[PDB]
C-alpha cells in the first residue's frame, strides 16, 4: 500500500520538472486515493502581488466545464424533462432551417451534428444573433456520422437542456449539480468576495484571465479550486455515495458510451478509453492535431452505460490556464492538476498517468 509520503515524493518528482520545463507559475493538484483526496500545491498564483497557489486558489477550468454541462444534462434526462434523442428543435422552435431536421440533442452534446465549428463567431452576442449563427450554419456531414470537437455544439446542448426547467443555466446548475454536491467555490462568476483567490492565468510572460462569451459557462467558463475539484471528481469516480438519485444517474449518463471514435469513446462532456490503456495512446490522442479533427464515429446503440474499467478524462486550456482531469473507476483512483499556464496536453497526459501509475 503506497506510502503518504511515497505519493508526496512521486507527486513532487513529477510536478516540479514538469512546471520548470513549461514554465508554469503555479500548480494545485489533487489525488483521489483509497477514498479521499491528497492535496499539492505548487509555486505562485500572482506573480506580481506575489500571491502563493493555495487550495483555495481558483482556476479557470477552460474545456473541463464541459463536464459539468454533461452531468447537468445526464440530470435533466434523469429527471424526465429531455431525452439525448429529441429533436434540437424541439427545444428551439425558433431554429427553422431544414438543415436542423434530424439532428438531435445527442448529437450537439457529443459533437457529432455535422460539422458546427470549433468557436461560437464573436460577433455573436445576442439571443438574434446565436439564432442567425445557427440557422445559416449549413453541415459539412450528415448527423452522427463525423465527431467535430466543438464549442458551438455542446454549448447549445447546455442552453438547450435546462428549457423546460424554467430556470436560467448558471441557476440550473447550482441548484441541481454544486449545492448537491457541496461544490461551493465553484463559479461562472466569481462573487466580490471571493476574488482574492482568483490566479491570474500567464501567456509568455503576460497576466491573462478568460473573457466573457457566447454560451462560454457551459463550454469553457467555469473557475473552481482544487478541492472542489477533487470532489467533483470523486462523484463522478464513485457515484454510488450521490443521494439524489436523478443526479446519481446524470453521472452515469456522462460517462456513459454514445460513439466510439478510434480508440476514444464520448460521454456526455467526458470522454473514455478502456482501461488498461497504454500512456501513448492517451497521450498521442491529446494532441491538438488528432483532438481538433473531424473524425468519423462509430455510433454505440443503445449507448452503453459507464465501464468501470475505463480511463475518464477531460482537457481544459483558456488563453492563462492549463489544466487535466483523469480518474479510473475501477481503481477508485484519480487525478486533478490545475495550472496557471496553457502548457501542451501531451505532457499533461504523461504526467498524470506517470503519478497514477504509481498507484
Ligand atoms: C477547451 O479547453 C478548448 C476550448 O476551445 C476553449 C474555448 C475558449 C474560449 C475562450 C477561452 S477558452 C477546447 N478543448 C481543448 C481540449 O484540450 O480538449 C481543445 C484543444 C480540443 S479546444
Given amino acids: 500500500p503506497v506510502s503518504e509520503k511515497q505519493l508526496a515524493e512521486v507527486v513532487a518528482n513529477t510536478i516540479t520538472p514538469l512546471m520548470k520545463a513549461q514554465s508554469v507559475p503555479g500548480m494545485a493538484v489533487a489525488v483521489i486515493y483509497q477514498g479521499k483526496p491528497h492535496y499539492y500545491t505548487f509555486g505562485k498564483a500572482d506573480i506580481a502581488a506575489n500571491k502563493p497557489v493555495t487550495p483555495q486558489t481558483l482556476f479557470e477550468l477552460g474545456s473541463i466545464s464541459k463536464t459539468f454541462t454533461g452531468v447537468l444534462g445526464g440530470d435533466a434526462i434523469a429527471r424526465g424533462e429531455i431525452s439525448l434523442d429529441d429533436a434540437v428543435t424541439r427545444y428551439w422552435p425558433q431554429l427553422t432551417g431544414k438543415q436542423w431536421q434530424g439532428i438531435r440533442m445527442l448529437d450537439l452534446a457529443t459533437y457529432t451534428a455535422g460539422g458546427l465549428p470549433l468557436q461560437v463567431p464573436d460577433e455573436v452576442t445576442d439571443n438574434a444573433s446565436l439564432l442567425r449563427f445557427y440557422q445559416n450554419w449549413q453541415p459539412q456531414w450528415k448527423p452522427g456520422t463525423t465527431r467535430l470537437y466543438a464549442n458551438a455544439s455542446i454549448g447549445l446542448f447546455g442552453a438547450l437542456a435546462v428549457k423546460p426547467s424554467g430556470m436560467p443555466y448558471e441557476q440550473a446548475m447550482t441548484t441541481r449539480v454544486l449545492k448537491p454536491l457541496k461544490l461551493d467555490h465553484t463559479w461562472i462568476n466569481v462573487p466580490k468576495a471571493e476574488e482574492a483567490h482568483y490566479a491570474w492565468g500567464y ?147 504523461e504526467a498524470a498517468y506517470h503519478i497514477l501509475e504509481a498507484l
Fill in 203 to 349: 501567456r509568455d510572460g503576460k497576466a491573462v484571465r478568460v473573457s466573457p462569451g457566447m454560451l462560454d459557462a457551459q463550454a469553457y467558463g467555469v473557475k473552481t479550486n482544487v478541492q472542489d475539484m477533487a470532489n467533483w471528481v470523486m462523484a463522478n469516480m464513485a457515484p454510488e455515495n450521490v443521494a439524489d438519485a436523478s443526479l446519481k444517474q446524470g453521472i452515469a449518463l456522462a460517462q456513459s458510451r454514445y460513439w466510439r471514435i478510434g480508440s476514444m469513446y464520448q460521454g456526455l462532456g467526458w470522454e473514455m478509453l478502456n482501461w488498461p490503456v497504454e500512456a501513448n495512446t492517451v497521450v498521442e490522442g491529446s494532441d491538438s492535431k488528432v483532438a481538433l479533427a473531424p473524425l468519423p464515429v462509430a455510433e454505440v446503440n443503445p449507448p452503453a452505460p459507464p465501464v468501470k474499467a475505463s480511463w475518464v478524462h477531460k482537457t481544459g486550456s483558456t488563453g492563462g490556464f492549463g489544466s487535466y482531469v483523469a480518474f479510473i473507476p475501477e481503481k477508485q483512483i484519480g487525478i486533478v492538476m490545475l495550472a496557471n499556464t496553457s502548457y501542451p496536453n501531451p505532457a499533461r497526459v
